[PDB]
Design a protein around this ligand. Structure first.
Ligand SMILES: *[C@@H]1O[C@H](CO)[C@@H](O[C@@H]2O[C@H](CO)[C@@H](O[C@@H]3O[C@H](CO)[C@@H](O)[C@H](O)[C@@H]3O)[C@H](O)[C@H]2NC(C)=O)[C@H](O)[C@H]1NC(C)=O
Ligand SMILES: *[C@@H]1O[C@H](CO[C@@H]2O[C@H](CO)[C@@H](O[C@@H]3O[C@H](CO)[C@@H](O)[C@H](O)[C@@H]3O)[C@H](O)[C@H]2NC(C)=O)[C@@H](O)[C@H](O)[C@H]1NC(C)=O
Lengths: 274, 95, 51
């Protein structure tokens, strides 16, 4: 069947930037249509770049033969430079002594309507997140829970970091069952800098209760350096517009945010832990 | 397998067939989807000027970007190789 | 088979609508029908799928 590694979400109504089969034991590759390689025992790098007015939407690599190893233990594919939403990325994939062949297809969508709000949301986001996994709750306090079937890492206390299908995910802080989803916001590449902030309504029925962040970021190594995302100030009832700043060690490529509102919320959410 | 033959003028047949048997026991020379070629490695070292290089090459293994067949001028180089290998892991202090 | 190009009493709105429909038809319809094949093959002697 093959080992399929995914970056981004596949769309059935789009076109592919290119598609090529690569012999991973070749030294070096064949420069197909003008793209360079770097092949080693432990690494395979494709310095792909396109000459079309479009932005990368997804990447899928199929490795042969199929080897029974879970793909959620570590990360295999990542665009070292650029990534999803750009026109080119330096795609790095780490090989094994058994994998000897690869089949790389890359998809791009027109740069005009270069948005991903139509594929990462789904039909009902109330019970299912972007990962496609259902929400699980606990009866101790009627709130959410934690998932332990994917790749996660922590740096400080009460820090959540998830990585799946090239998606980096975080939740601040926790979500209640009775809350009703309002809407979402997206950030394009042209609106992304080293540091940037957001402004959200926090009045009447738009009282902020829970937020989640999904993004695509670059890596300078197999182990990434997570951005330092921290809330500034207090999202209290007095200040009508709540704000949040982002500090990044590595430049981001895409950003998606979902808004959860509950008028009965007190503006603070933290377990009885120390 | 490491072999230090100085001669190898055959007497009693050729050792190719038994290498074939060895790799057939381990399921190496039967399929290409799972070659499993890296589970057997044969290294043969040549000593002296009376060596037959084609026989040694046909007796040893062959994998790309790697050298499994060697040859030295004298027996001294045989322990020079391994003393160098020992000294490789030594700290850079010694001259 | 009709070959009508306007002319008559109040034969203007229909001509405009049919001409704009024909313009949309020309703009949208390609010279052919959709054709995007993804043909793969597999060999009992080769591990990779040649696509
Ligand atoms: C096997 O080959 C791969 C490439 O296919 C090697 O990965 C590359 O290794 C070099 C040197 O370690 C990395 O260069 C780095 O560049 C940054 C840029 O500022 C520099 O600051 C560092 O000091 C370093 O020189 C390069 O990024 C890296 N590429 C990837 C995609 O990871 C790998 O090292 C090779 N392994 C060997 C030879 O054992
Ligand atoms: C809603 O706003 C809250 C207050 O804004 C922050 O704090 C002060 C006012 O309390 C803002 O003005 C400052 O006032 C100081 C006097 O107390 C001056 O000395 C100072 O120069 C400045 O003018 C200040 O700009 C503003 N930001 C910061 C970083 O202090 C804030 O506390 C809430 O968190 C905010 N609600 C949110 C962000 O959801």
């Amino acid at each position: 069947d093959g080992d399929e590694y995914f970056i981004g979400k596949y769309k059935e109504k789009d076109e592919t930037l290119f598609f090529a089969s690569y012999g991973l034991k070749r030294d070096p590759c064949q420069i197909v249509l003008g793209y360079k390689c770097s092949n080693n025992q432990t690494h395979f790098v494709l310095n792909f770049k396109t000459n079309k007015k479009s932005c990368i939407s997804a990447i899928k690599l199929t490795s042969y033969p199929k080897i029974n190893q879970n793909s959620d233990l570590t990360r295999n594919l990542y665009c070292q430079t650029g990534g999803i939403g750009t026109d080119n990325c330096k795609l790095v994939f780490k090989k094994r002594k058994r994998q000897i062949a690869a089949n790389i297809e890359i998809y791009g969508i027109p740069a005009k309507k270069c948005s991903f709000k139509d594929r990462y949301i789904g039909a009902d986001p109330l019970h299912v997140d972007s990962y496609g996994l259902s929400y699980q709750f606990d009866q101790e306090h009627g709130w959410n829970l934690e998932r332990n079937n994917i790749f996660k890492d922590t740096r400080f206390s009460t820090e959540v970091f998830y990585h799946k299908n090239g998606l980096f995910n975080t939740q601040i802080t926790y979500l209640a069952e009775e809350d009703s989803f309002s809407e979402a916001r997206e950030i394009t590449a042209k609106d992304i800098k080293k540091k940037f902030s957001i402004i959200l309504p926090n009045e009447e029925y738009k009282r902020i209760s829970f937020l989640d962040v999904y993004w695509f970021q670059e890596t300078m190594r197999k182990k990434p350096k997570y951005p330092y995302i921290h809330y500034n100030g207090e999202c209290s009832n007095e200040n009508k517009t709540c704000e949040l700043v982002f500090d990044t060690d590595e430049l981001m490529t895409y950003a998606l945010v979902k808004v959860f509102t509950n008028p009965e919320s007190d503006g603070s959410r933290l377990k009885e832990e120390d | 397998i490491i072999l230090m033959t100085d001669g190898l003028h055959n007497m009693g047949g050729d050792p190719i067939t038994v290498i074939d048997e060895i790799r057939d026991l381990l399921y190496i020379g039967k399929d290409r989807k799972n070659p499993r070629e890296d589970y057997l490695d044969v290294y043969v070292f040549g000593v002296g000027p009376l060596v037959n290089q084609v026989n040694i090459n046909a007796l040893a293994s062959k994998k790309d970007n790697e050298q499994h067949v060697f040859k030295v001028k004298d027996m001294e180089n045989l322990e020079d190789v391994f003393y160098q290998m020992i000294d490789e892991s030594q700290s850079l202090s010694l001259c | 088979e009709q070959r009508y190009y306007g002319g008559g009493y109040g034969s203007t709105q229909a001509t405009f609508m049919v001409f704009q429909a024909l313009a949309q038809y020309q703009k949208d319809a390609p010279d052919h029908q959709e054709l995007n094949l993804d043909v793969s093959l597999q060999l009992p002697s080769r591990s990779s799928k040649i696509t």
